[PDB]
């Protein structure tokens, strides 16, 4: 007398699920020209819930059933990374932590993913020191067929900084809502009945990076101890 | 004191050049150039270095993605079957075809086994029932008595979605920038070259004094 | 749509020889962009001094609802700008 | 998971952090005691009581961590929230 | 095989099988409709390709 | 104030050559063209250059893409089949 | 342009996500703002 | 799913948020509390009324988040519906 | 599938989405609410009457999507089909 199934989700349907059930089933065996149970092999259902997460309730009596999925997942971060580096004047220097690993590629040859920093000043006498930059963070995210991908993100400017002060480089700022929804339809719209009939699924999400950059200028022999102490 | 010494080398060897002997060399370490000509020449480029000297604005570039998107569709419709007496059946959709369910069912049937020259059931497969049920979504009522059936479908799916990105870059006036937050994939291609993916944005402001950036 | 034909267009009975699919969809996309001159050296700091304390607002309101599990432990933050003098080099000044 | 706890001895160091990140000597935060090294007599009285004014010292040194100072001739002394 | 003609089959088919004698009767009426419109749009300077 | 220096670099460069010794460059960094020619042909190069500086229009250009369709089809006939 | 996406994500958000009230959902920041209501008061006084 | 709740201190803080974006000294969103750094005496009461008339601060000082204000010499002060 | 339901919110917001796309200011469409920005009293009697007059504005206020409206000094007053 029928069924009612929603693909949203994560949300494992209901189909699917009453087919596993009955594939664990016990199958009572005989041989002749004994009585033992194979019992069942649940590989069928337990690939279902490999990744599943969050409640399901049931009512599972006399083959017919009502499933109840919910979850509501919620993540954070938060992070602070600053690299530093000293050079003389008009002299280029690099500074990677990371590490270095091999791309296919044609032949293997050798990248270098992480934390880098290479950049060349030169002070511009209004006590200003004038960046030629170059920032990048990477790193190993997985596969694909045939390789490796890395994350990356990384922004080679020119920017203009005072002597102790901070500018900002560069910065992404990323929101999304996303929504989805599925009904029978006519009797989702019931304003108190209708959440029986529906399935929803809601999404949000947001990212915030900013790179600053704050030179400083040791002109002194006593400015390198001054900092390089501290 | 703004000028990188080199930059300045080519330009005022062309300058010098047609304004005869002269020569130009840029210390790269202590940036400054050295200009060996006459008394007259020198007094030449003297007032060139002075007004190429000046100091450059630097320009914050800003970028807003925008997207809205908005799906919809809605899906219904009634399927018969029955005895030698007949069948209806539509392949709209996603909407599942009465056929060849009424066959899935059957091919669930338990079938009595014996083995003779037991009294085991192998019970059923359905390998082929769950296959149409894999992908399918929203209502299916049904009247299944008497192999003749009724099969009222209906769904309807609807999505939203919001985007707001707004990467931004800090250069220099005239120079250019570049900006990447992405991920770096191979292609395959041939030979795996490696390509880059992501947000990006490669800007190259110049100031045009009506105080307006191109 | 599909139908019988004939039955499919009687105006009350004929929705139980149809099957019928719509679809409607729509997006928009549009890009942007503001360029913003810094030519001061209090310019560079005026701007690029607003979107520090709007990320540390951020790293802050982050701190305030802390780690669930561990508290009170931490977390980055990033440092103030003009912090001026803790309190007890505060004090030194008053001595000497 | 479940409560205090509480307070430092990583405040207690994270206190004598903020002081030296400005300096100029050091500040050592050795246990939940802070430290400072560098004729200051009538220093004392003037320097300790503006600490013993600030709300913070008047916080902390009622939170529990405890300050010392120490000046080079040598010499030094320990002050809470008692001797304030 | 009786399922893999079925697979692609659209409406109607009224029968009578009755002592393998039979009078088959198939009708449909597919009907389908579109409309699209996109609007791309760029902005340039004069002179300058986009 | 409007050209990109480098490309009139080479528009001035013909200007100038059969005009004719005379010199130009440009400065990238700074946006700036350098004329070095006698007093007579400088007056001239003036002139081009003002008159080549003039600020440009933008154009915003939309396509609009319509597509309507609309399909049709009707099926009908009988069958028969019997014993031998 | 810029006041007809803005209209389509206050629309977009005047129905909220049916799930979390209210929360937020991107929307793109208004052309002349003015100024906030406190920066307003701080005018009145200095 | 399912009813206020309601309100901030998101928006206690999106409202500090709002007020620093223009600036000009900083505010700080402190928990529900919203802060503002910099002889403003008789700035107070005029300062103070503008927001007591707002409608918005009628609606938040009765909506339930706080208020405060900082000056720098020193001083600050909170206020909510009541003083108002 | 199945009846109204009817009106808007949506063609209240593509009302104010059609006297926009023209402007000039602003017209926001809050709710089923229609809003405009921008001493014009005198304008109101003169200005509303003729909305009362517009037989869309007699079938719209009469439909039962709300009209509003603001000007800028500051304020602003509702209208509908009582107020016509």
């Not at chain 2, 020449?41 to 000046?54: A, N, R, T, Y």
């Not at chain 2, 369910?101 to 085991?120: D, E, F, Y």
Request: one cysteine or more.
């Amino acid at each position: 007398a029928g069924l009612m199934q929603f693909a949203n989700g994560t949300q494992i349907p209901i189909g699917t699920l009453g087919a596993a059930i009955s594939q664990a089933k016990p199958q009572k065996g005989s041989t002749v020209i004994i009585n033992p149970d194979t019992n069942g092999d649940l590989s069928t259902l337990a690939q279902l819930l490999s990744g599943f997460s969050g409640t399901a309730v049931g009512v599972v009596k006399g083959d017919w059933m009502a499933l109840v999925q919910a979850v509501k997942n919620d993540s954070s971060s938060n992070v602070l990374s600053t690299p530093s580096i000293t050079t003389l004047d008009n002299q280029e220097a690099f500074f990677m932590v990371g590490q270095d690993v091999p791309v296919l590629t044609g032949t293997v040859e050798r990248k270098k993913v992480g934390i880098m920093l290479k950049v060349t000043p030169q002070i511009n006498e209004g006590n200003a020191v004038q960046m030629v930059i170059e920032q990048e963070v990477s790193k190993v995210e997985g596969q694909t067929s045939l390789d490796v991908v890395f994350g990356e993100r990384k922004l080679k400017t020119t920017v203009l900084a005072n002597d102790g002060e901070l500018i900002v480089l560069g910065g992404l700022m990323d929101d999304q809502a996303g929504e989805s929804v599925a009904k029978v339809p006519l009797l989702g719209d019931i304003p108190l009945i209708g959440n029986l009939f529906k399935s929803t699924a809601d999404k949000k999400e947001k990212r915030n990076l900013m790179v600053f950059i704050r030179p400083t200028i040791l002109r002194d022999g006593m400015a390198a101890d001054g900092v390089s102490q501290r | 004191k703004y000028s990188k010494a080199e930059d300045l080398v080519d330009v005022l060897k062309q300058v010098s050049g047609t304004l005869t002997i002269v020569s130009i060399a840029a210390s790269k370490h202590s940036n400054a150039l050295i200009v060996t000509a006459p008394q007259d020449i020198m007094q030449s480029l003297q007032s060139v270095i002075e007004q190429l000297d000046i100091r450059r604005a630097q320009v914050h570039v800003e970028a807003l993605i925008v997207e809205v998107a908005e799906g919809s569709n809605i899906n219904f419709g009634v399927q018969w079957a029955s005895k030698d007496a007949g069948l209806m059946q539509f392949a709209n959709g996603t909407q599942i075809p009465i056929g060849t369910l009424g066959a899935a069912i059957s091919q669930a049937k338990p079938q009595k086994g014996s083995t003779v020259i037991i009294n085991p059931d192998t019970n059923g497969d359905l390998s082929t029932l769950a296959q149409l049920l894999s992908g399918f979504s929203g209502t299916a009522v049904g009247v299944v008595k008497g192999d003749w059936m009724a099969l009222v479908q209906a769904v309807k799916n609807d999505s939203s979605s919001n985007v707001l990105s707004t990467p931004s870059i800090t250069t220099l006036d005239n120079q250019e920038a570049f900006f990447m937050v992405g991920q770096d994939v191979p292609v395959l291609t041939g030979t795996v070259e490696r390509k880059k993916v992501g947000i990006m944005l490669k800007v190259t402001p110049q100031i045009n004094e009506g105080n307006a950036v191109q | 749509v599909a139908k019988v034909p004939l039955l499919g267009d009687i105006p009350l009975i004929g929705n139980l020889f149809k099957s019928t699919a719509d679809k409607k969809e729509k997006r928009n996309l549009m890009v942007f962009i503001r360029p913003t001159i810094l030519r001061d050296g209090m310019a560079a700091d005026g701007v690029s001094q607003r979107k520090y304390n709007y990320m540390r607002a951020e790293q802050i309101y982050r701190d305030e609802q802390g780690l669930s599990l561990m508290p009170h432990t931490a977390q980055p933050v990033l440092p103030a700008q003009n912090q001026a003098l803790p309190p007890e080099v505060r004090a030194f000044l008053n001595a000497g | 998971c479940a409560s205090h706890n509480e307070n430092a001895s990583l405040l207690a160091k994270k206190q004598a952090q903020n002081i030296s990140q400005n300096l100029p000597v050091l500040a050592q935060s050795s246990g939940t005691t802070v430290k400072m090294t560098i004729t200051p007599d009538a220093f004392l009285t003037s320097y300790q009581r503006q600490m013993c004014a600030d709300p913070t010292v008047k916080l902390m040194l009622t939170e529990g961590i405890n300050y010392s100072i120490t000046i080079n001739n040598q010499y030094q002394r320990k002050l809470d929230r008692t001797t304030c």
